[PDB]
Amino acid sequence: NLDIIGKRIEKIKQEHETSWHYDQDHPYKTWAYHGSYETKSMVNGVVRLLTKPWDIIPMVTQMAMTEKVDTRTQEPKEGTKKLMKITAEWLWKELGKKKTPRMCTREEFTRKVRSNKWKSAREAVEDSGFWELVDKERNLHLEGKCETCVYNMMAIWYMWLGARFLEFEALGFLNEDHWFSRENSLSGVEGEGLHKLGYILRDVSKKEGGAMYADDTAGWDTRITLEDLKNEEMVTNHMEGEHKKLAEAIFKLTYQNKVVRVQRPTTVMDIISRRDQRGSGQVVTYGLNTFTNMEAQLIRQMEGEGVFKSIQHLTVTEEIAVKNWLVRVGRERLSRMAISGDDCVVKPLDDRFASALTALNDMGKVRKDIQQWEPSRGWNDWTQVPFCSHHFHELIMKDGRVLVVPCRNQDELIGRARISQGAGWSLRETACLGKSYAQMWSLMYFHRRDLRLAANAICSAVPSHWVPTSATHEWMTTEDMLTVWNRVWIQENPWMEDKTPVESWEEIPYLGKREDQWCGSLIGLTSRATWAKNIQTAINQVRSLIGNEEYTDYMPSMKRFRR
Numbered sequence: 001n002l003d004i005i006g007k008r009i010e011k012i013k014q015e016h017e018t019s020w021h022y023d024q025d026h027p028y029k030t031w032a033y034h035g036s037y038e039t040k041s042m043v044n045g046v047v048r049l050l051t052k053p054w055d056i057i058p059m060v061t062q063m064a065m066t067e068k069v070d071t072r073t074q075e076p077k078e079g080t081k082k083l084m085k086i087t088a089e090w091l092w093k094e095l096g097k098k099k100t101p102r103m104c105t106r107e108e109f110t111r112k113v114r115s116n117k118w119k120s121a122r123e124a125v126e127d128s129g130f131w132e133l134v135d136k137e138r139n140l141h142l143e144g145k146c147e148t149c150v151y152n153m154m155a156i157w158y159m160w161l162g163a164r165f166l167e168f169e170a171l172g173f174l175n176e177d178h179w180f181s182r183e184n185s186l187s188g189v190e191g192e193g194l195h196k197l198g199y200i201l202r203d204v205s206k207k208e209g210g211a212m213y214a215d216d217t218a219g220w221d222t223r224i225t226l227e228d229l230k231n232e233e234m235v236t237n238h239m240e241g242e243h244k245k246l247a248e249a250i251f252k253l254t255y256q257n258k259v260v261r262v263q264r265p266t267t268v269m270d271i272i273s274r275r276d277q278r279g280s281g282q283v284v285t286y287g288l289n290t291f292t293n294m295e296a297q298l299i300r301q302m303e304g305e306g307v308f309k310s311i312q313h314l315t316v317t318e319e320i321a322v323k324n325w326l327v328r329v330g331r332e333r334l335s336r337m338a339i340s341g342d343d344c345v346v347k348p349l350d351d352r353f354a355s356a357l358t359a360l361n362d363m364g365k366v367r368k369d370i371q372q373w374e375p376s377r378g379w380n381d382w383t384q385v386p387f388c389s390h391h392f393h394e395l396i397m398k399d400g401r402v403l404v405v406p407c408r409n410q411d412e413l414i415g416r417a418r419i420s421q422g423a424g425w426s427l428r429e430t431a432c433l434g435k436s437y438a439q440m441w442s443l444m445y446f447h448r449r450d451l452r453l454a455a456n457a458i459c460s461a462v463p464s465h466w467v468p469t470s471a472t473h474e475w476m477t478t479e480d481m482l483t484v485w486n487r488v489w490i491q492e493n494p495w496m497e498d499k500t501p502v503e504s505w506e507e508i509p510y511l512g513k514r515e516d517q518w519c520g521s522l523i524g525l526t527s528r529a530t531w532a533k534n535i536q537t538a539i540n541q542v543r544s545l546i547g548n549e550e551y552t553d554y555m556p557s558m559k560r561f562r563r
């Protein structure tokens with residue numbers, strides 16, 4: 001502990017030697033406090049002016065206004081611990097069968113920062129001194145020591161660009177080489193895209209079994225145990241030479257021991273430490289969350305099938321039974337799930353899964369909004385299952401071909417598009433962000449009447465050649481959106497046997513009007529009728545603010561506006 005954290009703490013203490021104050025009123029129970037020192041969402045106007053009816057919907061307007069991290073998870077039982085290690089060992093082998101671990105490069109890192117001591121990260125990557133500091137820490141990590149890998153809590157834990165690269169170097173391959181691809185993981189959806197998730201849930205529904213279960217975990221990142229962090233580290237058993245040592249060092253020194261700087265208003269910076277819970281880059285968090293969630297859900301499926309009786313201790317024959325289950329049905333059982341970090345849908349063999357709660361509760365993966373020992377409520381219809389903040393409609397085109405389309409409450413979609421992240425945005429930057437939302441809506445949400453109309457209005461109000469700005473983001477392009485639609489929904493869609501291109505937006509269907517209203521459409525209101533009727537006047541208001549640019553009228557892509 002202090003041997004691994006001291007240097008990091010020793011170092012911060014000196015840079016603030018004229019402030020070190022061991023505040024005795026520190027609020028930390030579960031975090032080890034080490035000392036203190038002295039320290040100190042905007043509305044997108046283009047989207048809002050073209051969505052006026054929503055100016056009076058509180059669910060939209062409130063979205064733009066405005067003691068769980070300090071908890072302690074218990075050590076699981078011996079039987080639980082054995083089930084986790086055996087499952088983790090087998091899972092890493094399976095993920096590894098068709099992938100080779102490998103180091104990610106300065107080059108790869110240098111490129112990303114350029115596609116989004118030093119002001120920005122863009123500058124540091126172009127300074128040799130930064131890489132020299134990286135070299136110093138890198139050689140420190142080969143030595144089994146750490147000086148500069150310190151979390152900054154804000155719950156999103158920032159590190160300085162150097163520590164990020166060393167994380168990326170060692171573990172980037174998990175994301176960069178698609179370890180949690182459905183093809184490689186069977187349960188995963190990494191890189192799948194929102195136009196694929198519905199087809200994937202429908203494929204799970206086709207399996208023989210019971211209800212579909214979609215239990216959310218109450219603060220997944222705070223329930224990651226030291227035993228979880230150790231089972232994740234076993235990916236290093238698949239590595240070699242330098243890589244193996246670098247990966248080991250990130251797991252030992254930054255994940256399984258942590259130093260964090262936090263702002264407290266009583267304003268001081270508190271330097272706290274702990275060994276458990278999740279703390280990594282958002283992208284390594286995603287991959288290790290998916291891995292550990294895959295492991296927890298295979299084990300819950302084991303308990304429902306009665307592969308083991310007691311979590312208190314596992315017999316020698318029970319280890320044989322668990323190992324044999326994995327070898328004979330593990331792959332089939334993985335296929336019965338869709339897992340995206342802390343998010344899952346499971347279609348188990350039968351409904352015994354609903355009351356199989358002992359291992360799940362003992363791993364610390366306690367379900368949200370349900371009593372600890374109350375059986376899970378399953379879904380009977382795949383089109384009602386929540387996954388990745390969506391539900392999925394089955395939608396038949398005039399020509400009989402089947403679209404499985406993503407959906408959510410339309411107030412959420414309009415409230416998000418009306419928000420920009422940051423300040424110093426030009427009108428052109430603001431317009432280009434509005435266009436990114438409009439093109440997403442045309443590609444993913446075309447079946448919502450209000451969104452197809454608002455999307456066409458925004459793309460009409462923003463100069464035709466201005467480039468949109470901000471899994472798979474096909475709407476980030478200047479190509480014609482009907483051509484992108486055809487590629488995404490027809491040409492590249494493995495669930496579509498007939499590849500006949502669509503020739504206009506009118507061949508592309510909407511939900512039923514009642515279904516559209518159920519999911520938050522304002523179709524049928526007076527406010528929405530006036531907006532639709534007078535849309536060219538809203539389009540002209542925004543054109544006049546942006547100025548004398550080249551614009552396209554997209555509204556005649558819709559029949560009601562086609563004269």
Ligand SMILES: N#CCc1nccn1CC(F)(F)F
Pocket residue numbers: 109112113164165167168171172173175281283284
């Ligand atoms: N595994 C990792 C980190 C990662 N993957 C994609 C982007 N990033 C962030 C980084 F650029 F490295 F800082």
Ligand SMILES: [Cl-]
Pocket residue numbers: 378379380381384
């Ligand atoms: Cl249902």
Ligand SMILES: [Zn+2]
Pocket residue numbers: 137141145146147148149253
């Ligand atoms: Zn370090």
Ligand SMILES: [Zn+2]
Pocket residue numbers: 391393407408519
């Ligand atoms: Zn819907």
